[PDB]
Design an enzyme around this catalytic site. Sequence first.
Site, mmCIF file in Angstrom:
data_model
loop_
_atom_site.group_PDB
_atom_site.id
_atom_site.type_symbol
_atom_site.label_atom_id
_atom_site.label_comp_id
_atom_site.label_asym_id
_atom_site.label_seq_id
_atom_site.Cartn_x
_atom_site.Cartn_y
_atom_site.Cartn_z
ATOM 1 N N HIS A 28 -0.630 -8.807 -14.106
ATOM 2 C CA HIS A 28 -0.336 -8.085 -15.386
ATOM 3 C C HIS A 28 1.161 -7.742 -15.538
ATOM 4 C CE1 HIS A 28 -0.936 -3.934 -13.495
ATOM 5 N NE2 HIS A 28 0.071 -3.689 -14.346
ATOM 6 N N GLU A 52 -6.128 -10.127 -10.500
ATOM 7 C CA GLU A 52 -4.841 -9.394 -10.536
ATOM 8 C C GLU A 52 -3.915 -9.874 -9.404
ATOM 9 O OE1 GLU A 52 -3.688 -5.670 -12.806
ATOM 10 O OE2 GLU A 52 -3.180 -7.813 -12.906
ATOM 11 N N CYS A 137 3.643 -1.266 -9.998
ATOM 12 C CA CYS A 137 2.670 -2.372 -9.817
ATOM 13 C C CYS A 137 3.408 -3.628 -9.269
ATOM 14 C CB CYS A 137 1.839 -2.608 -11.081
ATOM 15 S SG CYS A 137 0.497 -1.416 -11.413
#
Lengths: 171, 172
Positions: A28, A52, A137
């Site tokens: 993402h 992911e 992230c």
Amino acid sequence: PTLWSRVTKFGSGWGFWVSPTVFITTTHVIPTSAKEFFGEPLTSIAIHRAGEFTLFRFSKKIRPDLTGMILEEGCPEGTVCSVLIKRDSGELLPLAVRMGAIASMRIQGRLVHGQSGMLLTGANAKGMDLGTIPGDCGAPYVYKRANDWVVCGVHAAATKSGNTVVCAVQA
Amino acid sequence: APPTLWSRVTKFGSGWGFWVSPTVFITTTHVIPTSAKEFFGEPLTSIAIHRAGEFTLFRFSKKIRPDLTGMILEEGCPEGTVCSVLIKRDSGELLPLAVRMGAIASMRIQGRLVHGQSGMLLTGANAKGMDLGTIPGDCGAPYVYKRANDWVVCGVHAAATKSGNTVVCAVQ
Ligand SMILES: Nc1nnc(-c2ccc(O)cc2)s1
Ligand SMILES: Nc1nnc(-c2ccc(O)cc2)s1
């Protein structure tokens, strides 16, 4: 010679050099418009995605100063991993994470598949320096085993306290 | 941790010290150059020194750091408080290492006798080495924690075990 040298700003987060040719990140955070990464034409880059988790393999050595590390699909339950968080402030924030089962978990409204963990700083992250925030992230999960550092995944998500986390894993 | 706390962390002898106020500087006793007769352009005679084991406090007769405000220095912290140790590393890298604080303790580490407030690093399974833990040149780095509305300094880095998670904070 440092692990921290391998953590690199990338799209809306971070990524990690496993080897001179191998770069891992959280799906993402990857830019959705691009002709090249790290000066190399996207036409010469292999991309392997599993939910992911994203792995890039380049056709020449981007980081020839590095040696290749062990990459594994998560770790045993009860391993205390370190998440290697870099911040735009200049801060380096290694945080201990006790790892649990692989699962599809509900996190702030969304379903995320990966290895669960819980920060040892516990309670509430109270202060940006004792938990994760959204910009983190793609940071790596690592631990030491015998003489070797093992990388077992990338930071995918965290609940509102910042204390339950999900580590996206290969395959 | 806020930029105003990192601006107080000053390279000193074989490690670091910390500006509590414009006139007050704290460090770990063993990082002090034993030959030094002058600090920040002041002679030893114009400086008040308070020494308790591995804790040293310098009080100057004029403002050395007039850009600063005085902040709270306390004698360690309650058992179970989570602190950050404010460690500077090669080339503008800032390493605020998380530590859960424990009891006042006396230990033998690398053969040396050490006394202060013990803690357990919260960075990994074991912090052996420079990516997850402390190295000799880290001594003097401050232990800080945030409360409801402000920040507190509660000692200086004095020692750490070989191959574990245990550190010692020298206290006033
Ligand atoms: N698709 C791939 N899965 N693992 C790869 C790998 C792992 C460790 C390394 O050091 C280099 C490459 S390639
Ligand atoms: N002997 C001393 N113990 N504390 C001192 C202190 C504390 C906060 C300040 O802002 C300035 C000085 S002096």
